[PDB]
Amino acid sequence: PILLFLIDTSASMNQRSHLGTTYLDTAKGAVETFMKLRARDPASRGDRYMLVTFEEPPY
Amino acid sequence: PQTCWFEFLLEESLLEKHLRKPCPDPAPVQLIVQFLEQASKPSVNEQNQVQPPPDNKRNRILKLLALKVAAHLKWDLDILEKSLSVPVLNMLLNELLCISKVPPGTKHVDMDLATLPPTTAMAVLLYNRWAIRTIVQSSFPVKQAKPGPPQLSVMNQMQQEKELTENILKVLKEQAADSILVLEAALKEMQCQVCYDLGAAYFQQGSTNSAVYENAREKFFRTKELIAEIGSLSLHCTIDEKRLAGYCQACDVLVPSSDSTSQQLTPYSQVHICLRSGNYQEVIQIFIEDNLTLSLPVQFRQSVLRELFKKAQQGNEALDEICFKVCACNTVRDILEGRTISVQFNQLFLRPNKEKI
């Protein structure tokens, strides 16, 4: 299937947790663990993972 | 070289040669640890059934060899406690009681020690002394080493032995007073050791009760008398004169028997007794003498000042004047060292008069 990640890049994710880590970095780690689990699934050959930000097109 | 419990199990003069060696490898306490570990290894029945180890002939041989090495080491409770663990001591003294042929389940206070055989008598006595000292060391606060990242098996074994140690400690705490009675009956060098153990147990228990402080005082005075009688010939009695002297200083603070010169003449104890009595003028005189001599601790003086001002809050105004006096003394002392000046002194100094200046 197609996997798409629309991830906020608003300055709101420049807030940090009690872990000393920003929300943006927490999002990146969550996506990393997600695709690790999706590779644990044998359907990773059919999986495609694309990325979209909040900024203006064409970027 | 390495000689182990299989060699000692098969042949006993091997263990005799090991204890006759000037440098036994391993140490005799390590030999005891190995013997009692082999004896305490549980039985795994073929259905993977965990059970207590049956006391076979090999187990009895291990136990008697451990007891023989302990007799060779002359049952030094200091060495045993410093080198071996509490459940190991518990089962070792239980096996010693069994080989001394005391019936298990019978309370030790029931048997008359004079009627008992002498070896059985010191066996029961050493068991009770071990129980008392084990309770004392349990009460002693021990710092923990730094625990690293988790390793599950070793913490399983440590948690298991810690739970067993806790159960043994609570059993000893339940049976503490009967051990005290047995120790007293035995008191009716080993006498000095028993009397010191009784005094230390009295101090620990009487941390709530000044009557048991008085019992500890009598025990420690008798212990110092036994020390004076025995002298340097104590081949088995090792009691520290400094800790018993501190015990006796505390106990004489608690109970004054007059004759202060043979007793204490320190300004510290004079402040103590004058605070207990109410001779605050003498307290002021001792404080100005301390301003001259620079002996008493500055934090001691500060705590005295705080306690007196708490009394002033409780409602004595003569003590408020004495608070001003001792504040002046502590202030001029702290100037003599050259430290800062207290907000409390300035607060008292807000509205001075001719008398104050």
Binding site: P1, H18, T33, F34, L37, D41, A43 | -
Partner: protein, 59 residues
Amino acid sequence: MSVESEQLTGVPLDDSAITPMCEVTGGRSYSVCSPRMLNQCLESLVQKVQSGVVINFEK
């Protein structure tokens, strides 16, 4: 650090403006507070990765 220990066995729904559009398109929007239930949310999405048709059902 959250002094309260999360004894929740499930993922509570969030209160956001993305939530109605998420429900309309057929998704359960998640709000997270700790890494443990973040992993729970992530494995919930991993189990949610399937192929199907979203159909409005009306009696």
